RNA sequence: AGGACUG
């Protein structure tokens, strides 16, 4: 009992395809998991090779939910990279294509202790670690943390899912990226 | 990390 939600909740990139991988075949493959409304393999133009990649648009997040759930996929006799796609309008920022397990998680003021995050976050995966950040050589709160768990789509299906309350506090909740986010 | 490079 849901609508549609906007594209870029549906929407999967798949990286490291084979050279013969076509966009039946990849399409074939996620349908296992629900209806697809549009499939693309990228190409050169000039040779018309594959580009190695493609996206897959579900018709509800919980079918991409359900595909992520069920990696490793493996199309064409290659195990495929699949990850939550970046929007074209975002694909620019630092960090944007850049996979990891480090959920950084601010606004939650000086209540807000591990145990807050355990129970909130718990129900998106297998969490490894939880800090809550204290001032070096006070010990006072800073108002944030990190949580990492053994997986990077919780990460991705978390900020996508940009507005999160926790202990009564709009937490402000992206990747924990280190200088990683340098490329031009 | 995007199809219209069909701007």
């Given at each position: 009992?849901?609508?549609?939600?906007?594209?870029?909740?549906?929407?999967?990139?798949?990286?490291?395809?084979?050279?013969?991988?076509?966009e039946?075949?990849?399409?074939?493959?996620?349908?296992?998991?629900?209806?697809?409304?549009?499939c693309?393999?990228?190409?050169?133009?000039?040779?018309?090779?594959?580009?190695?990649?493609?996206?897959?648009?579900?018709?509800?997040?919980?079918?991409?939910?359900?595909?992520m759930?069920?990696?490793?996929?493996?199309?064409?006799?290659?195990?495929?990279?699949?990850?939550?796609?970046?929007?074209?309008?975002?694909?620019?920022?630092?960090?944007?294509?850049?996979?990891?397990?480090?959920?950084?998680?601010?606004?939650?003021?000086?209540?807000?202790?591990?145990?807050?995050?355990?129970?909130?976050?718990?129900?998106?995966?297998?969490?490894?670690?939880?800090?809550?950040?204290?001032?070096?050589?006070?010990?006072?709160?800073?108002?944030?943390?990190?949580?990492?768990?053994?997986?990077?789509?919780?990460?991705?299906?978390?900020?996508?899912?940009?507005?999160?309350?926790?202990?009564?506090?709009?937490?402000?909740?992206?990747?924990?990226?280190?200088?990683?986010?340098?490329?031009?």
């Amino acid at each position: 009992r849901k609508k549609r939600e906007k594209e870029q909740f549906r929407k999967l990139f798949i990286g490291g395809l084979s050279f013969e991988t076509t966009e039946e075949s990849l399409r074939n493959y996620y349908e296992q998991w629900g209806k697809l409304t549009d499939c693309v393999v990228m190409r050169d133009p000039a040779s018309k090779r594959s580009r190695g990649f493609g996206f897959v648009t579900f018709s509800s997040m919980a079918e991409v939910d359900a595909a992520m759930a069920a990696r490793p996929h493996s199309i064409d006799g290659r195990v495929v990279e699949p990850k939550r796609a970046v929007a074209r309008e975002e694909s620019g920022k630092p960090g944007a294509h850049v996979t990891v397990k480090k959920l950084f998680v601010g606004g939650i003021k000086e209540d807000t202790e591990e145990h807050h995050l355990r129970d909130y976050f718990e129900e998106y995966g297998k969490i490894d670690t939880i800090e809550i950040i204290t001032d070096r050589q006070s010990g006072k709160k800073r108002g944030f943390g990190f949580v990492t768990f053994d997986d990077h789509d919780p990460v991705d299906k978390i900020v996508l899912q940009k507005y999160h309350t926790i202990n009564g506090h709009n937490a402000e909740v992206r990747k924990a990226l280190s200088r990683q986010e340098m490329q031009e």
